[model samples]
Target: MIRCIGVSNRDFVEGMSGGTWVDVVLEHGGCVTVMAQDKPTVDIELVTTTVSNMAEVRSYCYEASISDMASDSRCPTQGEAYLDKQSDTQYVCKRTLVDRGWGNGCGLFGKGSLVTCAKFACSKKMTGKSIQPENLEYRIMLSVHGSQHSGMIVNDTGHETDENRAKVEITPNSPRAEATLGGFGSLGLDCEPRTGLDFSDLYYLTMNNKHWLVHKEWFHDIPLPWHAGADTGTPHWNNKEALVEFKDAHAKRQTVVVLGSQEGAVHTALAGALEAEMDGAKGRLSSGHLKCRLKMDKLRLKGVSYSLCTAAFTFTKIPAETLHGTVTVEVQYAGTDGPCKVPAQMAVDMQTLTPVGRLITANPVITESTENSKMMLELDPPFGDSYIVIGVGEKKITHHWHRS
Candidate 1:
């Protein structure tokens, strides 16, 4: 015979006196055992009330039968309920109790029946036994009012400023005395709108299932193509190929960047594309004699001595202020040029539009197609990690040709 064991991850409050609700479904062969611990992650806090004043509350209700139908309530009780092979719809209940010792009128000391007049005695062995397969398909409820509890979620607003404070109260969807999952606990699951603007992007970090306090967000705009006027082979500068010479100048002398574990192949390609486009824009924005180019040789080689042409492109004539509204660029690097240790991938937040932040980022492993007019890469570590997409209507290409 073989047996396997698993530790339980659920918890409960002890000496609890408030309404409690829980719904447990046992499979055909399922069994549950209850145990207690000295220290737990959950600390339920309960409020105490006088018995006479504790008239109503929300929680689960439990029902059971004792062997001594006419006698004690403190006896060790074990019961079984099952579906009849014939009825299939009804259940049969059988219960038994054993004497531990003796006390008063009820043996367990029920000198009085009044909940307020009598003190309750709970057996230290209040632990539950393994469940029987036949005894499946039953529900149990427990309700106690004016009971103090820990582990409960309490609103702690000691640090809330006037602007951040808000509250709302509503009636429960179910009645106080039902046996369904709804009647198991006074506090049901809650879903609420998070704190942030609708258009803003937010990212949060958590630890140990508890809120630690780090919140962040970003904004984005549409991305524009790098050079629109040039076709597959021309620099569009008097139909000359001077763009190639300019790109080579930057490529022949540049610092290599980290592009994760792939050696920055894509990053270098993007950087070169960007430099070439910027140079082309400077000429067109001022002289009207030059236009953006797309020829292979017109791209600069950033962070490397060679140029990469197959995987990337750029956009030109972007206005300065618009860079703050949405940024989209991806690049890779070694630790030498930037803070990227181990080929870190970073994204751009155009909301601030700082010159440095205008570049959206991503690792080269991910390829974007014109289908979405955007690219998304998933670089495996020892490589790049995140992505950057520049926001549209946020960048302007307003430099005009001068007649000097």
Candidate 2:
């Protein structure tokens, strides 16, 4: 996840006209975002200055809007919960993003800890003398993985129409107070078309806070890489595997696990001759020397059993210069080894394979930069899945697998 290392947890606060602003400390390039969950819109304007082969970037605040609310207890239109029973403007605020190999980031808001929330002034008051609230320890965590969106629009938590893959956990007045809102808790979610939200569409809060809090849980989302010697005999205790080293965040140490089955799947492949769209689709529908990485471990996820040979995507692609268009590889049962022949829908039980959702949705992109060599792409499919789907303008290629 993107760590927010430069902003203050409490001291930073802004009083705007029906809106708010927050400083986004990013390593890449981002700045003060004119925001208002009520209708947050992020428009980044980069002022670039070039010196030799280097360039300096500066971001400006675009306009974002919010409406003036009247009371602590909300509804009819927007929802809110007064976390402080004694106060009308207080409650915790939160939003969660479904994992899409979204290599976490202190995206829109932040992870668990980085976001700090000041008691909502929501424009005005409660009982006479009990007005202006202070540190109501409320947290606003909004994580994300960027690069535009092109998928289905799901429902919010507790929503009926669709699945709430975007699970939003709002503990309305619990350890805080009974003061809750009418619009929040059961509200269905949909992206605020007017804002700049990545995977986690519309993220706003009418919830109040009692304890001024800024909770964050930031961890780099890079998994480990594996190697293979392809052996199957005499349960080796594996001393050599221990020789490889790692850093704090499972740092790297030129080491790898040894194993490979060369089984029936096409272990290596490639694609070429494709053009990437600028500010366009990265679909360079092509490839080169493709391979899959693996890890032999005790699968400890969900309800799955152990002795897992989890394969990952660490294999680099080809044409070193262009956007590696939809690279390809096929995993199939071998009619025979060595010559590795592909059998029609190999007779393997589908249960062992964990292929991706059948709705093959892939938008190609990210070759390199036209200016200089700065680059980024879908960076290949995620490491957690066993299969992948690549999409070109409209053409698509897919591969899936099941383990035994």
Best TM-score goes to which candidate? 2
- Per-residue lDDT of candidate 1, residues 1-404 (tens digit): 00001112222222112223222221112222111121111111111100111111111101111121111122223222222231211111122222333542233421221100111111110000121212211111111110111112123332133211112211122112221111112222121112332111211111122111112211011021011221434211121111111111110121112111211322332242211111211110110110110111111112222122222223332312111132222232211222111122223333542322111111121112222122221111111222333222333211211111
lDDT of 2 by residue, 283-336 (tens): 111111111111112111111121211122121233111122211232222111
Residue 309, candidate 2: Cα error in Å is: 33
Candidate 1: which stretches are off by over 4 Å?
1-117, 121-307, 310-373, 376-404
Model 1, backbone clash pairs (residues 3+ apart or across chains), number: 55
Of the candidates shown, which would achieve the greatest lDDT relative to the real structure? 2
Model 1 superposed RMSD (Cα): 39.8
Q: What lDDT does model 1 reach?
A: 0.19
User: Global CA lDDT of candidate 2, please?
Assistant: 0.19
